[PDB]
Amino acid sequence: MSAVRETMDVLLEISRLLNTGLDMETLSICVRLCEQGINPEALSSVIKELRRASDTLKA
Amino acid sequence: DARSWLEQHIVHQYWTSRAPRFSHSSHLHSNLSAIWDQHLYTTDPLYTPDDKTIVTETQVIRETLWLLSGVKKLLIFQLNDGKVNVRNDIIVTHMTQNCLRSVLEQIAAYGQVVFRLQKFIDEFRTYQAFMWALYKYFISFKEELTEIEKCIINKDETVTLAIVLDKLAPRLAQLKVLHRVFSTGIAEVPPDTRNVVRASHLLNTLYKAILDYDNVGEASEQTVSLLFCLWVETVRPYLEIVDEWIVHGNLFDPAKEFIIQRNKDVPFNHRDFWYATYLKPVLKQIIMAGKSMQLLKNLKCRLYTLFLESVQSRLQHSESVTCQSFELTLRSCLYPHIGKQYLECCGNLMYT
Amino acid sequence: MIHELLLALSGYPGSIFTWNKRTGLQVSQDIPFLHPGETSVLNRLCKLGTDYIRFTEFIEQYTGLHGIYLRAFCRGLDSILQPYRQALLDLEQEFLADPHLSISHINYSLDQFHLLFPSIMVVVEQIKSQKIHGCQILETVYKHSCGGLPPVRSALEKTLAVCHGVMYKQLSAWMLHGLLLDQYEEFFVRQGSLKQFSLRAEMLPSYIPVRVAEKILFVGESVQMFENQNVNMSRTGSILKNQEDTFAAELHRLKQQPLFSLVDFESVLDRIRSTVAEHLWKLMVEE
Amino acid sequence: PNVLLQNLCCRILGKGEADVAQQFQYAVRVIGSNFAPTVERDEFLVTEKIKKEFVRQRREADGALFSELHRKLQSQGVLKNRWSILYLLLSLSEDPRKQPNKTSSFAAL
Amino acid sequence: LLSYLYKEALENSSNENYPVLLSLLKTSCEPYTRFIYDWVYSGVFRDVCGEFMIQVNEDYLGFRDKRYWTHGYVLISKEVEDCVPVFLKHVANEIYICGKTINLLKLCSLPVLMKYSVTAPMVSHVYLV
């Protein structure tokens, strides 16, 4: 548990600077899926459709 | 599921959009915005409906509480740390967008000063003592803030945007006459020599300001008390250098600047060197005392505590009813406080 | 949230109050349900937990560089944590009383420790970076207490008190019958009757004149020559004569104050010299 | 992985614990398709693109900062999937510029 | 151990750890001071139990002239007793020689402050026999 948390915290530093605009929890899921093998291009695409879908819904 | 539990026991999020949204109430005059928007959308052929962050009515007064003393606000845009302004998407349902902008722009410009005044806080001697006097008012100004915070958590809520707004008005008028003092206070950084004129002339701008407010006071004497707090704690090292210059003979100064251009002559053919600075009658008392202590520590042969006490004794009987008018009388008690020590020091000179 | 934050500030990490050994104890960025504004004031409270574990390692490292005024300086550092830890405990009983609280209340109560703690953190880093030890510890804290900020000028006098007390162990033994107990050469009286004992300047406080240093040398040198002969012919002793009992008392009173003044010290350098000054005159007639 | 992607959908929408089934079904489809990413593995190549992107939004101070963060990141844990995370973030970046339109009337068309 | 405990008694620099070790150092000196007075009021070093140098001294009936000319030192682990309250930098050498002359009458605050108050009884008894 110690090792994992310490990469994430360094990982959240980059995400807020680079302007990802994702949440903490969601990022951990993105990283677990990668380590289990996912394509990056597909993964961003899914995130994007979900993101747009949430904004429209609220209004 | 835990996410859903949080979402009900905490008020719904409005810094990120992923929480559903209220802006309903059963009164007829509280859905004013939905009515106002509708009007614009049919009258004006060219209307641009903004993308509005739905707020969360009368929680704008909680962001006024934080903003006026406390931390930088990352819920609203601040272009820099001396320019506070309010995002153009904040709506409260029981007013117009524009109407809303206008109350939040008054407190924004009043939180612009306390936030600017907070960047001066450094966690030489004169500046460190002016910092602890500004910082002292900030911990007593949050006492009233933490009171108004317990009012909104109490059920029923009570507060609206503008109802505790004329309650925090004495402090509001106190942080503005701080602004006039401070602009005149530090605004000597581009000026040449940072040495004695900055320190002297910020004690002198405090001195100039207490005449402008005390002698027109007695209808806001709230602002007279504040400028005198800032003076009694700013004058506190600058008098106690003069206390060490007599009862020990020599004084303490920074090793990178002077705060009074008090200098002692190491060879003996003159006593002390003077260089003019910025009150004016008190400066002559320093010359004559140092002349006499400078011989007596090389050749023996043959104040702050008192200030506070003469101030208090006027007070238990700023304005006073044992002095007229007003603050220069409590000061002229101090010119005898130096004087009772000063004449008997110079007494000892001729004795050797 | 409120009570769990109190444990972050007595130096105990959650995974929410994560400890990093670079930038310190910090709140983790944009965790679910934490207001933008509340993370900003929670971060000002975490700087008072960052310098607090940067202070408790500084005690345990040097108790239980080398020096014996360093560890007197550590019991100098534990005394400023004393009101901090009481104000964490007065938050603690309030948040057991009811669970609805604002973090503005901890912000209000612990700003007082946001202007003692930065001003003392420069003190311990300055000690460890010039590598200084000894009687120049007493000099190092003293001239900062000359400096601005009333909280800090009263504070550092309490830090002054405890290493001034280990300076005072040196001057009770050096005047007892002589013999300096420094184990790492830490004082201002050089180690030398068998060989002549002088003064060093590489340690010697700069508010105690060079001509005062010798006022302490010579009275100790005169009992240093009976440390040589035999301790029952002493002009001080501890059963033999009552000279030392009087000296100790004058010592105890000057010691027990958190500020040390030189005018009072120099009047009892007279009395420690003048009553045993006639002993050495009554030596060399019969010698 | 079924659980992880479903939880991914629920979290982003901030609600819907079996109502995001339709979005989920799509996501399972996209992921089940294949890609050939231009630049495949190798840590140097992705770091170089991130720095250029930083300069372009005029965030220089951030470009310099990130590079220390990258060395740090490595030190904390070493993967063979390191690159996939850094490329993922890269693509998923957001520009500060412009308003992102309305969604309060764009929903309706 | 007893000489090591006085060395830790000289480190009194956080003065809450010093009184706790004082309690220890003083209990440890109880058997020790028994071994001081047994050797100069009878002139025989006694110690068969515990280690503080185990000997009983060498008897001699061919000698008489100080009794012992060989038996080692009485404490031979430092070759003269050192660094326990009692000054011992002449006092351990003056219990030594008083031990000889009882064999010629009979048979054939500061750690330095308690050091110096015990020292002056102990120079006074060595001159008393």
Side-chain angles (χ1 to χ4, degrees):
Chain A
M1 187 91 189
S2 198
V4 184
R5 83 185 158 238
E6 281 174 297
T7 40
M8 289 295 318
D9 168 36
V10 170
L11 200 86
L12 290 180
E13 296 177 76
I14 310 164
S15 194
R16 304 297 181 281
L17 298 164
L18 188 43
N19 293 0
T20 311
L22 195 49
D23 180 27
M24 179 274 300
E25 177 164 352
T26 322
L27 293 150
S28 314
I29 301 283
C30 304
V31 181
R32 270 88 277 202
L33 299 166
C34 296
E35 290 178 6
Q36 298 175 8
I38 201 179
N39 328 135
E41 284 166 281
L43 183 64
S44 40
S45 294
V46 303
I47 291 161
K48 297 267 57 57
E49 191 51 50
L50 299 173
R51 175 168 302 177
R52 177 197 316 284
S54 189
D55 291 328
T56 49
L57 181 61
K58 292 294 106 59
Chain B
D1 188 25
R3 177 184 74 242
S4 77
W5 193 89
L6 287 171
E7 200 157 307
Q8 295 176 27
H9 269 69
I10 300 173
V11 307
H12 298 278
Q13 305 191 48
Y14 63 107
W15 45 101
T16 184
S17 47
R18 56 166 200 106
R21 287 295 187 155
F22 57 79
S23 55
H24 320 281
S25 174
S26 66
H27 300 1
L28 306 180
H29 306 299
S30 56
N31 297 121
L32 190 153
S33 79
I35 302 164
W36 198 269
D37 191 17
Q38 59 170 246
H39 169 84
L40 296 170
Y41 191 91
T42 46
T43 297
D44 300 343
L46 291 185
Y47 181 55
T48 308
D50 289 326
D51 192 348
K52 307 191 184 185
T53 310
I54 306 87
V55 150
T56 72
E57 319 180 81
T58 70
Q59 298 303 135
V60 285
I61 193 54
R62 167 63 71 102
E63 311 320 310
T64 291
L65 287 158
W66 286 340
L67 180 60
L68 293 159
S69 186
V71 283
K72 66 179 89 172
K73 300 302 303 285
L74 303 183
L75 181 66
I76 50 179
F77 288 157
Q78 305 188 149
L79 300 193
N80 68 91
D81 286 13
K83 184 55 152 47
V84 175
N85 57 337
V86 195
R87 305 168 62 173
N88 294 171
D89 55 19
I90 309 295
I91 34 164
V92 61
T93 334
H94 76 298
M95 305 158 83
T96 297
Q97 175 178 57
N98 302 109
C99 195
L100 176 60
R101 190 76 41 256
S102 182
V103 197
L104 311 185
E105 285 177 318
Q106 307 316 308
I107 55 80
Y110 305 150
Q112 186 190 222
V113 62
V114 170
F115 193 63
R116 161 178 295 190
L117 286 160
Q118 283 153 4
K119 201 154 71 287
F120 183 63
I121 306 312
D122 297 336
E123 309 317 289
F124 224 54
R125 277 258 283 169
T126 314
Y127 276 57
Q128 295 311 291
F130 186 41
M131 149 274 165
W132 183 60
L134 180 55
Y135 191 67
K136 182 62 141 64
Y137 148 77
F138 295 147
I139 79 179
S140 294
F141 173 37
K142 294 194 305 306
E143 182 63 59
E144 167 150 18
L145 270 38
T146 53
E147 283 186 30
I148 301 166
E149 283 172 299
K150 285 301 187 290
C151 198
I152 200 162
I153 198 64
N154 181 260
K155 288 292 168 300
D156 75 323
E157 173 161 38
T158 307
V159 286
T160 173
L161 165 59
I163 192 63
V164 62
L165 166 61
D166 305 9
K167 305 282 177 295
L168 65 63
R171 308 299 297 196
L172 215 62
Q174 272 172 249
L175 41 79
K176 284 299 304 313
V177 311
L178 230 157
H179 218 163
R180 297 184 177 83
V181 164
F182 182 77
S183 62
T184 52
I186 295 164
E188 305 170 70
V189 170
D192 68 330
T193 84
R194 290 81 159 172
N195 291 344
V196 62
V197 79
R198 298 208 297 99
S200 302
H201 194 12
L202 187 148
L203 190 264
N204 193 253
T205 55
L206 281 151
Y207 190 81
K208 292 291 331 191
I210 199 67
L211 298 175
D212 292 358
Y213 293 81
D214 204 348
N215 294 143
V216 72
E218 288 185 296
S220 288
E221 58 182 300
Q222 280 62 76
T223 51
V224 184
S225 67
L226 190 51
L227 290 177
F228 186 100
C229 289
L230 300 180
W231 181 103
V232 65
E233 297 198 346
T234 295
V235 83
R236 174 290 296 170
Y238 184 92
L239 189 64
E240 299 282 94
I241 52 163
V242 161
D243 189 45
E244 296 194 77
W245 175 244
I246 300 159
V247 297
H248 296 318
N250 181 223
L251 76 177
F252 177 79
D253 296 321
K256 70 201 197 72
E257 54 177 73
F258 292 91
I259 72 186
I260 193 158
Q261 300 281 35
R262 195 76 282 201
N263 160 274
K264 182 176 314 295
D265 293 348
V266 191
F268 182 65
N269 68 125
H270 190 209
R271 291 41 68 87
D272 293 330
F273 292 150
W274 176 237
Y275 306 88
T277 195
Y278 311 148
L279 304 173
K280 303 281 291 291
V282 188
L283 300 177
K284 314 300 177 65
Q285 310 195 276
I286 318 316
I287 308 309
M288 293 294 289
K291 290 174 165 302
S292 49
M293 282 311 300
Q294 191 274 353
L295 208 159
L296 286 165
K297 64 196 262 303
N298 288 12
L299 196 70
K300 174 53 171 67
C301 287
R302 309 316 295 132
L303 287 175
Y304 191 52
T305 56
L306 315 182
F307 192 50
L308 291 157
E309 281 177 5
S310 197
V311 154
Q312 281 311 119
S313 51
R314 264 63 283 167
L315 275 157
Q316 294 168 36
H317 285 47
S318 194
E319 290 77 357
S320 183
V321 76
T322 32
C323 294
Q324 297 301 340
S325 307
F326 297 91
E327 82 306 300
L328 31 58
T329 328
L330 289 75
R331 290 168 168 76
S332 64
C333 307
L334 183 70
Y335 295 172
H337 295 333
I338 303 164
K340 51 79 45 76
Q341 195 63 17
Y342 169 58
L343 199 63
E344 62 171 54
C345 176
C346 293
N348 307 315
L349 191 280
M350 301 307 150
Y351 188 63
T352 60
Chain C
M1 171 65 68
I2 67 296
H3 159 94
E4 292 109 345
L5 164 57
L6 302 175
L7 301 184
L9 301 176
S10 45
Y12 309 112
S15 310
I16 299 275
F17 305 95
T18 54
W19 167 250
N20 207 347
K21 298 70 159 187
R22 307 161 72 223
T23 62
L25 195 188
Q26 63 171 14
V27 191
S28 295
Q29 309 312 318
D30 200 33
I31 48 174
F33 299 86
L34 187 61
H35 186 268
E38 292 170 346
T39 302
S40 309
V41 60
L42 283 162
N43 193 222
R44 300 283 189 272
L45 302 171
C46 295
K47 300 190 290 191
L48 312 155
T50 299
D51 61 30
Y52 182 83
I53 178 167
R54 300 186 192 263
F55 287 164
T56 60
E57 68 185 285
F58 186 87
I59 308 293
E60 298 164 309
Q61 175 56 32
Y62 300 83
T63 309
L65 279 163
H66 55 81
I68 68 185
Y69 290 84
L70 311 176
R71 165 165 52 247
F73 172 83
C74 282
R75 289 303 192 283
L77 192 62
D78 219 40
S79 303
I80 314 311
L81 316 189
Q82 179 53 55
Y84 190 54
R85 289 176 303 225
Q86 297 318 98
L88 295 160
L89 169 51
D90 298 7
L91 295 160
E92 160 68 63
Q93 64 74 235
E94 185 174 63
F95 308 162
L96 178 61
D98 41 35
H100 278 44
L101 259 322
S102 311
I103 62 301
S104 189
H105 180 263
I106 296 169
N107 198 37
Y108 155 87
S109 288
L110 290 176
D111 284 15
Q112 192 57 78
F113 305 106
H114 187 203
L115 60 67
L116 280 168
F117 288 179
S119 64
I120 198 175
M121 187 186 179
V122 84
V123 182
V124 311
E125 295 286 9
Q126 175 183 299
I127 295 167
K128 279 176 299 179
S129 178
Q130 306 324 134
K131 293 70 167 36
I132 47 157
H133 74 327
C135 196
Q136 61 183 327
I137 296 295
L138 171 62
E139 176 50 42
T140 285
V141 75
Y142 171 58
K143 289 287 184 60
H144 290 327
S145 62
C146 305
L149 295 131
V152 175
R153 294 191 77 237
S154 193
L156 263 62
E157 266 177 304
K158 302 293 172 291
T159 311
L160 188 136
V162 170
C163 74
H164 184 72
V166 162
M167 193 272 277
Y168 265 63
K169 188 167 67 178
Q170 263 56 271
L171 288 172
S172 55
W174 179 249
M175 284 313 196
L176 184 55
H177 186 76
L179 197 70
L180 203 55
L181 303 165
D182 59 352
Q183 293 313 124
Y184 282 110
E185 287 189 30
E186 285 193 274
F187 192 38
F188 37 85
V189 176
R190 184 63 162 114
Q191 292 186 291
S193 189
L194 292 195
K195 284 297 287 282
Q196 307 318 123
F197 296 62
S198 50
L199 309 154
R200 47 200 177 218
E202 76 204 55
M203 284 178 217
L204 167 59
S206 314
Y207 77 103
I208 314 189
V210 169
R211 40 162 305 245
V212 178
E214 55 167 66
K215 290 181 64 173
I216 305 164
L217 180 66
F218 297 148
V219 164
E221 180 177 73
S222 65
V223 284
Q224 192 50 44
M225 55 164 173
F226 279 150
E227 182 67 277
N228 188 259
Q229 177 35 34
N230 187 202
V231 298
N232 310 250
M233 282 287 130
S234 51
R235 60 195 63 204
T236 26
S238 64
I239 294 294
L240 294 320
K241 302 168 81 184
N242 72 101
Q243 298 286 6
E244 205 298 308
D245 295 11
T246 304
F247 295 153
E250 295 286 12
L251 269 53
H252 175 242
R253 289 166 57 173
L254 273 43
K255 181 191 174 288
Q256 61 177 27
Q257 288 304 287
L259 176 281
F260 189 57
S261 50
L262 311 309
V263 175
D264 286 9
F265 189 40
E266 283 166 358
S267 52
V268 290
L269 299 161
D270 187 18
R271 178 64 172 191
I272 202 170
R273 179 175 63 251
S274 62
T275 54
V276 302
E278 61 186 74
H279 203 274
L280 53 137
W281 194 75
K282 284 275 190 64
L283 277 184
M284 301 183 295
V285 181
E286 289 174 30
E287 189 187 68
Chain D
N2 179 274
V3 190
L4 265 88
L5 190 44
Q6 155 71 344
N7 182 46
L8 200 103
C9 304
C10 291
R11 290 288 295 122
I12 199 158
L13 277 159
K15 52 87 50 55
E17 298 186 17
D19 300 346
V20 297
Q22 61 209 252
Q23 277 316 315
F24 171 81
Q25 185 72 268
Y26 158 80
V28 170
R29 289 192 83 192
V30 168
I31 298 178
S33 306
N34 292 306
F35 285 95
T38 310
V39 179
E40 282 182 85
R41 290 60 164 78
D42 291 352
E43 289 278 71
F44 301 117
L45 301 181
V46 79
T47 315
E48 291 164 73
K49 285 302 177 296
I50 287 149
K51 291 192 296 268
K52 190 155 80 159
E53 290 277 296
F54 279 127
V55 178
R56 276 154 48 188
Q57 303 332 303
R58 278 71 63 167
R59 297 174 295 182
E60 292 83 45
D62 300 19
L65 175 57
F66 152 83
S67 59
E68 294 312 324
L69 303 185
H70 186 275
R71 305 313 98 69
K72 286 310 297 93
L73 186 69
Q74 291 184 268
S75 299
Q76 290 292 345
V78 187
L79 304 174
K80 295 61 150 287
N81 301 91
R82 21 64 179 175
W83 170 94
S84 186
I85 314 185
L86 298 153
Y87 190 95
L88 170 289
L89 289 157
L90 173 58
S91 298
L92 175 52
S93 171
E94 301 177 291
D95 283 4
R97 300 313 196 163
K98 308 290 177 60
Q99 309 304 98
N101 321 106
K102 295 87 237 288
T103 49
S104 316
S105 28
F106 185 52
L109 194 290
Chain E
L1 171 55
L2 185 63
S3 55
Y4 170 68
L5 186 56
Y6 179 55
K7 287 185 185 177
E8 296 181 319
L10 282 156
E11 322 252 22
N12 60 306
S13 309
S14 59
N15 297 118
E16 65 187 46
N17 291 4
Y18 170 65
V20 167
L21 292 171
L22 191 54
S23 303
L24 294 187
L25 173 60
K26 66 176 303 307
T27 54
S28 188
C29 285
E30 297 184 321
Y32 171 55
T33 55
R34 208 183 71 90
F35 295 145
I36 299 299
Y37 49 54
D38 67 17
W39 162 236
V40 291
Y41 290 155
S42 298
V44 193
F45 197 86
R46 304 199 182 65
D47 185 13
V48 299
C49 188
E51 173 168 305
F52 203 80
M53 187 59 195
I54 306 198
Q55 47 178 238
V56 72
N57 306 324
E58 290 185 85
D59 301 355
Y60 287 104
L61 296 305
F63 297 98
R64 182 50 192 136
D65 313 331
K66 284 190 172 58
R67 193 183 169 76
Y68 307 149
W69 293 108
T70 313
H71 61 130
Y73 237 80
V74 292
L75 173 278
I76 211 175
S77 170
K78 321 281 159 55
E79 289 188 0
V80 68
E81 290 177 354
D82 293 319
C83 53
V84 179
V86 71
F87 169 49
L88 304 174
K89 295 288 120 57
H90 51 108
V91 184
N93 297 318
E94 279 167 354
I95 62 177
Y96 198 85
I97 68 95
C98 185
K100 310 290 158 168
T101 56
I102 189 62
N103 285 336
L104 288 161
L105 291 161
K106 308 294 310 87
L107 320 184
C108 61
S109 276
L110 325 175
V112 278
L113 185 59
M114 57 188 300
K115 182 171 303 295
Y116 300 131
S117 44
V118 158
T119 278
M122 298 281 210
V123 152
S124 181
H125 93 256
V126 290
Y127 311 145
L128 209 46
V129 188

